[PDB]
Design a protein around this ligand. Structure first.
Ligand SMILES: Nc1nc2c(ncn2[C@@H]2O[C@@H]3CO[P@@](=O)(S)O[C@H]4C[C@H](Nc5ccncn5)C[C@@H]4CO[P@@](=O)(S)O[C@@H]2[C@@H]3O)c(=O)[nH]1
Lengths: 181, 181
């Protein structure tokens, strides 16, 4: 089933990352200056993209880790897309708690296509086993990192976080990446 | 490359159609009663989905046909999705002109995944020829009509319009479907 992950990786890039990454640093500037709390840390640059290989994508991040808490939204990006006037691209800023205190602030979300690889394995008519799914989850991440390696839109404004669950802390996995910068 | 279209069809269903179709008749009710012009035709039920097999998806429908004109937006649907608080699902209402007069009003848009099959054929690193693309465009449409055939969310609130360009009128192709109901 090689082609499934390949197509979803190209779709994620073409349909989302190449569209929102060019305007992301500008949107974070705007938030930092005009909407961020005077007394709090600037939102970090770069979109943090969670890639659970078990494809467990909760809709609420706080369900993954209590130490990951919704703070605010960036200014919305809108554009005409395929006959939709003002299609909305929205992103969410999280606080990452270390010892019940804020250790960092970033734009953070899951790669939605993985929620879709999950659903596809659950639907009989899709013909996609749960074995197929760990494999295609890996291929999706690889394909996406190859694409971004050559992408002119990734000018260091995007960070992939791939991880496997065997006590594992997501907030710690994000802070580990966030602190490399 | 069978698996490319298959995955994008399942993604379109899981990631969009199964989420927005259940709440679509309610959203059209609301528009008809509270926002539609007193003196104009009700917006038709059902989401009209354009499926050009040449995968030519302009962002503005008026570029496909001057007789297809943006009228208004439905009320926005929002929900937490994969760590995005209040991700926005937006749809656009078009007037279909026959003889410079309104012959019909419907929620109308292109299947975005086809814009993506187009882009994929244009990018060297995707490894996807323009021959592959007409084939995968056909498979996408088939896979999608099989999915919807069994879908509990498609309770006759969704209409696929597949078409090939060889004078062809899109507004006439939409009015032909719209008038079957
Ligand atoms: N027509 C129409 N189709 C839609 C819409 N929303 C989703 N889909 C389609 O549903 C399938 C799976 O959706 P998913 O969330 S898993 O994947 C998306 C995720 C990412 N896009 C975004 C956008 C905003 N915020 C965050 N990410 C790229 C990827 C492909 O996005 P596309 O636009 S190219 O098409 C998808 C795909 O086929 C919509 O509003 N209109």
């Amino acid at each position: 089933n090689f082609n499934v992950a390949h197509g979803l990786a190209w779709s994620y890039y073409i349909g989302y990352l190449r569209l929102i990454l060019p305007e992301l640093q500008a949107r974070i500037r705007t938030y930092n200056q005009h909407y961020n709390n005077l007394l709090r840390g600037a939102v970090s640059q770069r979109l943090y993209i969670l890639l659970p290989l078990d494809c467990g994508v909760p809709d609420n991040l706080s369900m993954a880790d209590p130490n990951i808490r919704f703070l605010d939204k960036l200014p919305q990006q809108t554009g005409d897309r395929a006959g939709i006037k003002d299609r909305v691209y929205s992103n969410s800023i999280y606080e990452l708690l270390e010892n019940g205190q804020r250790a960092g602030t970033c734009v953070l979300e899951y790669a939605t296509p993985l929620q879709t690889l999950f659903a596809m394995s659950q639907y009989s008519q899709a013909g996609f086993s749960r074995e197929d799914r760990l494999e295609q989850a890996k291929l999706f991440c690889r394909t996406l990192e190859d694409i971004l390696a050559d992408a002119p839109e990734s000018q260091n404004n995007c960070r992939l976080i791939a991880y496997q669950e065997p006590s594992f802390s997501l907030s710690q996995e994000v802070l580990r990446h966030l602190r490399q910068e």
